[PDB]
Ligand binder design. Sequence first.
Ligand SMILES: OC[C@H]1O[C@H](OC[C@H]2O[C@H](O)[C@@H](O)[C@@H](O)[C@@H]2O)[C@@H](O)[C@@H](O)[C@@H]1O
Ligand SMILES: OC[C@H]1O[C@H](OC[C@H]2O[C@H](O)[C@@H](O)[C@@H](O)[C@@H]2O)[C@@H](O)[C@@H](O)[C@@H]1O
Length: 237
Amino acid sequence: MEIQLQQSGPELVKPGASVKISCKASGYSFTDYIMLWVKQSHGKSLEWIGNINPYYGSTSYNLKFKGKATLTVDKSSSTAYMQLNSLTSEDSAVYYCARKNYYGSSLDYWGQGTTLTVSSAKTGSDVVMTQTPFSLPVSLGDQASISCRSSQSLVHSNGNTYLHWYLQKPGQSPKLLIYKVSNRFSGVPDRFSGSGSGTDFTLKISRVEAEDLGVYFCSQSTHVPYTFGGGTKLEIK
Ligand SMILES: OC[C@H]1O[C@H](OC[C@H]2O[C@H](O)[C@@H](O)[C@@H](O)[C@@H]2O)[C@@H](O)[C@@H](O)[C@@H]1O
Ligand SMILES: OC[C@H]1O[C@H](OC[C@H]2O[C@H](O)[C@@H](O)[C@@H](O)[C@@H]2O)[C@@H](O)[C@@H](O)[C@@H]1O
């Protein structure tokens, strides 16, 4: 098959109300993978909301969202839900669900996103990921190099380093490119290569083409809460 996460449609909701966004999983065994939710404010970086293990219904939240977001599942319909309460204009954003694997601790399949608009109208410190440059204008064909530095070592107890790279093309959800520093995800071209160790990581693109354009995000999942870099927009001069 093919794996799909299908989210409910755009929501226009009044301030103070609640909203419950759905994410229907197909193509894989729903209870065998953590489902994670992400907020993306129109400004652009990704923020972890929380995880749910659908087999148990057990949850973990980013402290920022604890008290605001509630994650549930319906196993019978292979559907994950995120409810947001006491909505204000600051909740207006795009929300993604994404499947998290165990072998890579990476977000391998993403929903298409749900846009929430909140309006009255009718129609241990967290680990910081510093990405540079924030903007990389290039000529087509150029080599491109993007750096990601973490405030703490990303080496996990098991000796692996859970640093990953995602590409979000214009108007799409993020997609996994590289997991665990240097491993190319299925279908990703050899022109992408990831390197680095400890706190310093690099993504290189050997010959940029149009399908590579968008915003790149590094992410770490060695430490809780999971965190993302601020993005690097790769675009043509
Ligand atoms: O760590 C030893 C166990 O490794 C596997 O289970 C470990 C975790 O791997 C899975 O991806 C998840 O299902 C986890 O819940 C699981 O604990 C298994 O091979 C297990 O038989 C080993 O004991
Ligand atoms: O060997 C390096 C460190 O490995 C473990 O901690 C690394 C990361 O593993 C955990 O999953 C999280 O607690 C992270 O916060 C943690 O740094 C530890 O054994 C640590 O003592 C080692 O220094």
